[PDB]
Amino acid sequence: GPLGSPQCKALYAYDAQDTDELSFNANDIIDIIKEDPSGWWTGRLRGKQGLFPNNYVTKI
Ligand SMILES: NCCCCCCCCN
């Protein structure tokens, strides 16, 4: 593609609340794998994959 694969930048830190969730720090860059319509997106960051709330991030 002309652009990289989709990413977003965390606006706020998120601490996973379940085993299927992803934790990250504010300003972390997350690779987006899936964008569920609920806003629970699937991301990868530093050797972790998991669900995270999209209201904590901004697409870049
Ligand atoms: N712990 C996250 C639960 C929220 C539900 C995520 C939706 C996944 C749908 N495959």
Question: Residue ranges of the domains in the chain?
Answer: 1-60
For residues 19 and 9, what is the distance between their CA atoms, to the nearest angstrom?
22
Do 24 and 13 meet the contact criterion of CB atoms below 8 Å apart?
yes
Atom of ligand 1 nearest to the CA of 20: 1
Residues 6 or more apart in contact with residue 10 via CB below 8 angstroms = 24, 25, 26, 27, 28, 29, 30, 56, 57
Report how this structure was experimentally obtained: X-ray
CATH number assigned to the domain covering 1-60: 2.30.30.40
**Is ligand 1 within 6 A of the CB of residue 51?**
yes
For residues 30 and 49, what is the distance between their CA atoms, to the nearest angstrom?
10
Number of CB atoms found within 10 A of residue 17's CB: 10
For residues 23 and 2, what is the distance between their CA atoms, to the nearest angstrom?
29
CA torsion sign, 16 to 17 to 20 to 21?
A: negative
**Resolution value, angstrom units:** 1.5
Atom of ligand 1 nearest to the CA of 42: 8
Q: By C-alpha distance, which of 48, 38, 52 is closest to 9?
A: 52
For residues 28 and 16, what is the distance between their CA atoms, to the nearest angstrom?
15
Do 24 and 30 meet the contact criterion of CB atoms below 8 Å apart?
yes
